[PDB]
Structure 1
Amino acid sequence: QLKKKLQALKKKNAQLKWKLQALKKKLAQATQHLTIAQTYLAAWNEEDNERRRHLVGQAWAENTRYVDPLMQGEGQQGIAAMIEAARQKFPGYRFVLAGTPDGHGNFTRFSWRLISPDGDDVAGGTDVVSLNTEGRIDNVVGFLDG
């Protein structure tokens, strides 16, 4: 069995190692969706509007587009304005991540809950974000949930 035992473990090692290859690949995935969710929500939860213009200018691409069921905008300026209007209408409100973001390719899906300034859970949404060939956000699509 001597030769068979050495060979038997080399075969086993080959499988286990490639599954570590595939498995670590899965880790970078779920973290990538969390980073995008945090950056997107960080912009929506940021109380100071100036930092948000700076953030979007840096993080977002110049050719970027957003659309949801009530409103739409494209570009850093347009999105910055939308963000400014939303925070001005709901001062103190916050967007908190819900569940674990997931996705595939340049698409990320995640859900979030809208938390009132006093901490009540009043609703939630879901968004899909796309990155451009330069690592900058080029597309965001939001949805409503019941």
Structure 2
Amino acid sequence: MTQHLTIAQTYLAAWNEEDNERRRHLVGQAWAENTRYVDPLMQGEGQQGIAAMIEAARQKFPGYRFVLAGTPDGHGNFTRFSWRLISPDGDDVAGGTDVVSLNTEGRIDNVVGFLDG
């Protein structure tokens, strides 16, 4: 359970990181070399690619933040969690849900996201 909360937190920390350099270092630590991401708006592969994708996403939504919603859960190497997108003025404008997979070495190898209203 805590293992699932840590994974949710590590994942969102990468999306909320303001400094693009620090984010590459974060993705470098948390994500696997063979890693893949896909949601309804985007896709990416590899540590580099995912770091680039997140940066591109943030440039389109400057000032926005991802805040965890509810309690992450899971089983085996799977973690599931949800988050809300918060506007620079503090408005809840949307949200999503993700299923994240860890490889046998504890690093994120696969993420599939969805959008929520």
Does TM, scored on the shorter chain, surpass 0.5? Answer: yes
Structure 1 position 90, deviation (Å): 1.4
Larger proportion of strand: 2
Aligned residues: percent identity? 100
SS of the counterpart of 2:89?
coil
SS of the counterpart of 1:77?
helix
Range with bigger deviation, 42-51 or 86-95: 86-95
| Aligned counterparts of 1:94 and 1:49: Cα–Cα separation in 2 | 15
**Residues 77-120 of structure 1, C-alpha deviation per residue, up to 9 Å, x if partnerless?**
11011011011111211000000111111111111110001000
Higher relative contact order (CA 8 A, sep 6+): 2
Structure 1 position 133, deviation (Å): 1.3
Give the unaligned 5+ runs of structure 2. none
Structure 1 position 126, deviation (Å): 0.2
RMSD after superposition: 0.8
Aligned counterpart in structure 1 of residue 33 of structure 2, from 62, 73, 79: 62
Larger proportion of helix: 1
| Aligned counterparts of 2:81 and 2:30: Cα–Cα separation in 1 | 19
Count of aligned positions: 116
| Aligned counterparts of 1:145 and 1:90: Cα–Cα separation in 2 | 17
SS of the counterpart of 1:144?
strand
**Residues 112-143 of structure 1, C-alpha deviation per residue, up to 9 Å, x if partnerless?**
11000100011110000000111111011101
Structure 1 position 69, deviation (Å): 1.1
Q: Compare CA radii of gyration and give the structure with the larger one.
A: 1
Range with bigger deviation, 95-104 or 84-93: 84-93
**Residues 26-81 of structure 1, C-alpha deviation per residue, up to 9 Å, x if partnerless?**
xxxxx111111111100000111100001111221110010111211111011011
| Aligned counterparts of 2:64 and 2:41: Cα–Cα separation in 1 | 19
SS of the counterpart of 1:141?
strand
| Aligned counterparts of 1:138 and 1:37: Cα–Cα separation in 2 | 14
